[PDB]
Every structure is written in structure tokens, then in C-alpha cells.
Design a protein around this ligand. Structure first.
Ligand SMILES: O=C(NC1Cc2ccccc2C1)c1nccnc1NC(=O)N1CCC(CNC(=O)[C@@H]2CCCN2)CC1
Ligand code: PRO
Length: 486
């Protein structure tokens, strides 16, 4: 109890989250606000999704690279500026010229793209970086989700035409769907950003949106931009095509950050602490011995180590918690807090029956398994835990959307912690109006009450013939998701 989570996820979400990330050993706080330390359990998740995404972009011929952390005023100006951090001094001496820390690397990378792209033969150019970027905002930070320094990948491609670039945009977007679904067990909604919310310089921005139903907040999970020729004009990225005509390249860029870990935690975490999809947990299983005063401990030890060797030989990493000075109940909580997917309990009653208790972290179901069946039952249960984590999250996402036709229905849905799907004319002017009015009518958290346009979903319902925009009364164009957000 006292060593566990003492705030309930539904009652005090913010304090629940802080306790989970600290007591599971994911995060350590730091003496610069908005900067957090990723402890091994957190960084292990990053490495897992890194290995997945690398394998998939390699099939698209994207290659990894590394560009400088810094950019000059000259390059940075061809295109954020209040959130760009500036280096001005080395030791006690001022720099000959101030240099900026990257908030994103378009201007750094595209500064040299013209030397590499001269002819249609040089296309497509497909690059990725795994790096950190810095956005020195003064909004309230949130570990993983909203931080001043964060780890990401950013991919950048250049193509001979629009069709090829746009196809890659949406190929990447589906890889993000898979990153979230297959490794983090998180469902997302694909869509297009509104004009007020798209990336600066983008022709259009596609997005994967997630939703945290316990506090009613959407979170942008990943992004994939069609840049058209906009950046090519700014940086003079021209190539000579097959007809000897100078053309601009069509560009994309796309990223996904350690925010994804925060979305995973907020999605699956419960009042016992962290819950990890097996694919991003170092230990799939912890084995906890129960001695119940037998005094024949070497029989228990010998049995638990047998189970450990059966799992490790099958390449299932695990831990046998044989620490003498702690009770089994202490150990149960210890590893539940840290999110281990499966606990195997071995006491004397179990030894006599040649079995063991296998306990799932997601729903705490326990079942007795014969020793010889442990490997197979473990393998299947790890698969089933992931399936259950995803399906439960998918149902909560489905349930968080209310379809509306008028503004009068909107504030009711927001106060029930919902997103709204609404018919919208998509006029950029209306975005600030909707934000203002929904914030005004909010009367409760420390995050904003404003509702904003999340995305125009790729999967559109029919737009009835005379449906009007829920806000302006003009004819509606498409259905758009709106909600409060991180
Ligand atoms: O944004 C983060 N921190 C900043 C700095 C800071 C400090 C304190 C409080 C708040 C904030 C916000 C952040 N922090 C940690 C992990 N991830 C993060 N971001 C992330 O995941 N993003 C989604 C992928 C991209 C999204 N695309 C776009 O935004 C474009 C432009 C409009 C819509 N389309 C990049 C942004
Ligand atoms: O920051 C962004 O949203 C885009 C995609 C990654 C690189 N720049």
C-alpha cells in the first residue's frame, strides 16, 4: 500500500501519473524544468520501437544519417523562433556568431540537399535521423508527453513528383499505426490536420491521434507531412528531369517521439502501477518463490531456477527474485509496479503437484500450469496479454467519440471527457473562434479548456446533402474530430 500507487487513476490522474512513472523506475526528475531522465526501463522501450521502425523504413530504402545539433541564423532564416534555444558563449567568451539548437532539422538538412540532388538520377533521396531536439517552450511540461528536450526520429525524403511523395507520406503513417499497435498496444486515428494546425511549410499534415479517456484529452501520436515543393523553393532544391527541365523536388518529413511511451503508460497503466506490453518489457516473467516456513528452500530454489532455464533457453528473458530479506507479497507489488507482464509463483503446494501459478499483470487472472506446459502457456499468454491490452484500449477509444451536428451538443460531450465528430466548413478563421468559446464555457486540471480541431479522419462518414457546419452554418465539407488535448 504505502510502497504502491496511492492516487487512483480516475480520481487524481496527474498525481497517479507522476507516481507511476517514478515508482516504476521509468523517469527521474532533474533540476532543469521540462527535462527528464529516461531510466533503463524507459529507454528499453525506445530501443524496442527503434529496432522495429528501423527494420520497416529499411524496406522503403530510407537510410539513417546524423546532422549537426546546431544551425546558423542564415540557414534558419530561409524558413518556432520563440522556442529556439541559442548558444552565445563558450566558457566566458562570446561566440563570434550565435548558433541555434535544432528544434527540427529541415533547415539544417535541406541546406545541403541541393549539392546531393542535381538530376532525376539522384532521386528519390530518403534519410532518417534518430536524435534529440529542443523546443524551449514555457507551457507546463509533462514527462514523456510535453518536454523541452525529447528523443525522436525525423525522416526526410525528396521525390521527382507529388504522387511518389504522397504515397510515402501514407506508408510512413501506417508504420506509425503499427509502431503504436504492435509494440505499444495503443490504437490511433488517422487523419489530416486542419489548416490552422498543420506544420509550417507543409502542403498537408497527416497525423495519428490518440486519446486518453481517463482525463478526456487527445494527444497527437505521430505526424507525416507532405511538404510539396514549399521547402524546395526556400532552399533551391532543383533537379534536371528526364526532359532536361529544371523541377523542384517534392518532399516529405515525418516524426514520432518518446511521447509514444507516455501515451502507452497513460493508456494501459492501472492503480497497481505500470502495465507493459510484452514486446517492450525487458523481463517477460518474474518468478517469485513462496516458502511458507517450509525450511526446504533448496527444493523451491532448485525448481524456480529450472523454470528460469526453460524460459531463457527459449529466449524469453525473465528474472528469479530470490532476495532473502523480502516477503512474497513485497515481491508481487515490486514487479507489478514495474509492469512485468507475467508473474510465476512457486510454493510448496505447487512443488508437490509439479505445477506453478501463472499470474497475468493485465487482469490479474491466475491459473495453475504443469511444469512441462509452462513454456507453451507462457508464450501464448504473452500474446494474449497484448491482444487484450489493445482491444480494451480500442473499445475505450471508440467509446470516446460522440457524433454531433450542432454546437449545442458540444460542451456536454467535452464535460463527459469525450471527443466530438462534427460537420465542419474547415475555414481556418473558425478554429480560433471554436477554441475561444469552448474555453470560455469550460468551468472545472491545469491544462487548457479549449477544444481544438484534432484531425479530419481519413475514414469519413457520408456527408448528408444539406448538412451545415456545426459552427458557422455554412455548408459542411467533411467530418472533423475536435477535443481538448495535450
Ligand atoms: O512537442 C513536444 N514538446 C514541446 C516543447 C514543450 C515543452 C513544455 C511543454 C510543452 C511543449 C511542447 C514533445 N515533447 C515530448 C515528446 N514529444 C513531443 N512532441 C511530439 O510528439 N510531437 C508530435 C510529432 C510532431 C508534431 N507535429 C506538429 O506539432 C506539427 C505542428 C502543428 C501540428 N503539426 C512533433 C511534436
Ligand atoms: O517536426 C515535425 O513535425 C516534422 C516531422 C519530423 C521533422 N519535422
Amino acid at each position: 500500500n504505502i510502497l504502491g500507487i496511492t492516487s487512483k487513476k480516475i480520481e487524481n490522474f496527474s498525481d497517479w501519473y507522476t507516481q507511476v512513472i517514478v515508482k516504476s523506475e521509468l523517469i527521474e526528475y532533474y533540476d532543469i524544468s521540462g527535462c527528464y531522465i529516461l531510466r533503463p526501463a524507459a529507454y528499453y522501450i525506445w530501443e524496442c520501437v527503434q529496432a522495429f521502425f528501423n527494420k520497416e523504413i529499411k524496406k522503403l530504402n530510407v537510410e539513417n544519417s546524423y546532422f549537426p545539433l546546431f544551425v546558423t541564423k542564415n540557414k534558419l532564416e530561409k524558413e518556432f523562433s520563440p522556442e529556439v534555444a541559442w548558444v552565445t558563449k563558450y566558457g566566458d567568451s562570446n561566440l563570434p556568431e550565435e548558433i541555434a539548437i535544432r528544434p527540427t532539422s529541415e533547415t539544417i538538412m535541406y541546406s545541403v540537399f541541393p549539392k546531393w540532388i542535381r538530376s532525376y538520377r539522384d532521386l528519390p533521396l530518403k534519410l532518417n535521423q534518430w536524435n534529440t531536439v529542443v523546443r524551449w517552450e514555457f507551457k507546463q511540461p509533462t514527462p514523456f508527453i510535453r518536454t523541452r528536450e525529447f528523443l525522436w526520429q525525423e525522416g526526410h525524403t525528396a521525390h521527382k513528383n507529388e504522387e511518389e511523395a504522397v504515397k510515402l507520406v501514407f506508408d510512413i503513417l501506417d508504420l506509425y499505426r503499427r509502431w503504436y499497435e504492435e509494440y505499444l498496444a495503443v490504437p490511433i486515428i488517422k487523419g489530416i490536420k486542419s489548416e490552422g494546425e498543420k506544420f509550417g511549410g507543409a502542403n498537408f499534415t497527416s497525423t495519428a491521434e490518440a486519446f486518453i479517456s481517463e482525463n478526456g484529452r487527445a494527444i497527437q501520436a505521430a505526424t507525416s507531412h507532405y511538404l510539396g515543393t514549399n521547402f524546395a523553393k526556400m532552399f533551391k532544391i532543383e533537379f534536371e528531369d528526364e526532359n532536361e527541365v529544371k523541377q523542384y523536388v517534392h518532399q516529405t518529413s515525418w516524426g514520432c517521439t518518446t511521447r509514444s511511451i507516455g501515451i502507452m503508460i497513460m493508456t494501459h497503466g492501472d492503480d497497481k502501477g505500470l502495465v507493459l506490453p510484452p514486446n517492450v518489457s525487458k523481463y517477460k516473467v518474474v518468478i517469485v518463490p513462496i516458502f511458507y516456513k517450509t525450511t526446504d528452500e533448496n527444493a523451491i530454489h532448485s525448481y524456480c531456477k529450472d523454470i528460469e532455464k526453460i524460459l531463457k533457453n527459449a529466449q524469453i528473458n525473465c528474472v528469479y527474485d530470490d532476495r532473502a530479506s523480502y516477503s512474497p507479497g513485497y515481491k508481487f507489488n515490486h514487479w507489478e509496479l514495474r509492469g512485468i507482464p507475467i508473474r510465476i509463483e512457486v510454493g510448496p503446494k505447487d512443488l508437490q503437484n509439479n505445477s506453478c501459478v501463472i499470474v497475468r499483470r493485465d487482469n490479474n487472472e491466475k491459473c495453475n500450469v504443469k511444469k512441462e506446459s509452462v513454456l507453451l502457456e507462457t508464450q501464448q499468454m504473452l500474446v494474449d496479454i497484448h491482444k487484450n491490452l489493445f482491444l480494451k484500449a480500442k473499445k475505450k477509444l471508440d467509446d470516446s467519440i460522440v457524433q454531433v451536428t450542432s454546437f449545442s451538443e458540444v460542451m456536454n460531450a467535452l464535460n463527459k471527457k469525450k471527443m466530438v465528430l462534427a460537420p465542419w466548413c474547415e475555414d481556418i478563421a473558425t478554429e480560433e473562434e471554436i477554441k475561444k468559446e469552448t474555453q470560455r464555457l469550460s468551468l472545472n486540471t491545469t491544462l487548457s479548456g479549449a477544444m481544438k480541431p484534432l484531425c479530419i479522419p481519413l475514414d469519413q462518414p457520408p456527408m448528408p446533402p444539406n448538412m451545415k457546419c456545426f459552427w458557422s452554418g455554412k455548408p459542411a465539407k467533411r467530418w472533423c474530430l475536435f477535443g481538448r488535448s495535450y
